[PDB]
Amino acid sequence: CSDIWALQGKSTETNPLYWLRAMDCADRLMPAQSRQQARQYDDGSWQNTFKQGILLADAKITPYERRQLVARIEALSTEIPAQVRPLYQLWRDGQALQLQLAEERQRYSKLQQSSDSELDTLRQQHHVLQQQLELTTRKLENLT
Amino acid sequence: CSDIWALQGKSTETNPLYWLRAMDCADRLMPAQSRQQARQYDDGSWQNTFKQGILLADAKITPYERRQLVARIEALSTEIPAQVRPLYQLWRDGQALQLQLAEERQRYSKLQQSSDSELDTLRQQHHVLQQQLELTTRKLENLTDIERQL
């Protein structure tokens, strides 16, 4: 695997088996090791953005890190060699769906947060208003 | 693309470029085309069921149906050749995330539905009790002004 990460050249870029082996090899990595190794592949070329993304995707990233990753992955779609596009697309679909799932979960937290607090606020009012009604009914009886 | 689905044998089942091209050819199909082709690969072998999952995954199917497809090929997943395995785990996790997203959208609909209805009953109770309190409060004050002046 050590050599798979090092390989460069038109022969390997355009070969879907090279990229499949890289994705296979990233899986064998402890997530801290994946994150650390991704840091090397930052020359901004499309070959290196794809390697870095492949490594970062096993690295246990925050939703915000994935948002940026999927943005970078999509950016370079016009440079993906034709014969590599199916593999790239399936791997990218995987990152986008994991990104949608973090988003839906965030949507579900905002609903639960806001609806539960407006619920609790209503019950606060249902007690304050209730007490006021009774007190008022009391002053009406103790009218002279 | 039309020939690609017919192929069989060890030289192609162990072949990740074969299955990549098949994943690409599936995209070119419309759902009716997609379901018609899947019907032709039903025997239950892992090749045929991996073929059916690939064709139907994007054929406008239901989550229950998607779950059924994935379980059929998952039950046979120990058989997938070494060279195809990382391609399979890629394709299964895609299907698996789709299943999670449908579960999460249902869970969300539920909470929206249930909190909404609980939010409407309590908001109505709040308005009604407000009007009760306004009426009793103006009555108290009307009677207080009278006694005060008397």
Task: Supply the DSSP string of B81-110, one letter for each residue.
Answer: -TTTHHHHHHHHHHHHHHHHHHHHHHHHHH
Is residue B119 within 8 Å of residue A115, measured between CB atoms? yes
Contacts of A93 in chain B (CB under 8 A): 94
Domain annotation covers residue B115: yes
The alpha carbon of residue B6 is apart from the nearest alpha carbon of chain A, in Å, by 20
The alpha carbon of residue A139 is apart from the nearest alpha carbon of chain B, in Å, by 7
CB distance from A82 to chain B under 8 Å? no
Q: Is A138 exposed, middle or buried (0-12, 13-18, 19+ CB in 10 A)?
A: exposed
Q: C-alpha distances in angstroms, B117 versus A109, A119, A143, B107?
A: 18, 11, 41, 16
CB distance from A108 to chain B under 8 Å? yes
Residue A118: CB atoms within 10 A of its CB come to: 13
In this complex, the residue of A16, A90, A111 whose CB is nearest that of residue B94 is A90
Specify the amino acid at residue A85: R
Contacts of B19 in chain A (CB under 8 A): none
Domain annotation covers residue B14: yes
Contacts of A105 in chain B (CB under 8 A): 104
CB distance from B17 to chain A under 8 Å? yes
What 3-state DSSP class applies to B142?
Answer: helix
Specify the amino acid at residue B106: Q
Q: Is B128 exposed, middle or buried (0-12, 13-18, 19+ CB in 10 A)?
A: exposed
Whole-number Å distance between alpha carbons of A83 and A137: 82
Whole-number Å distance between alpha carbons of A121 and B109: 23
Domain total in chain B: 1
Q: Could you tell me which residues come within 8 angstroms of residue B57 by beta carbon, excluding any fewer than 6 positions away?
A: B26, B66, B69, B91, B94, B95
Counts of helices then strands in chain B (DSSP H, E): 6, 0
Question: Quick one: CA dihedral B109, B111, B114, B120, positive or negative?
Answer: negative
Domain that holds residue A94: 2-141
CA closest to B147 among chain A residues: A144
Q: Whose CA is closest to B73, among B97, B102, B93, B58?
A: B93
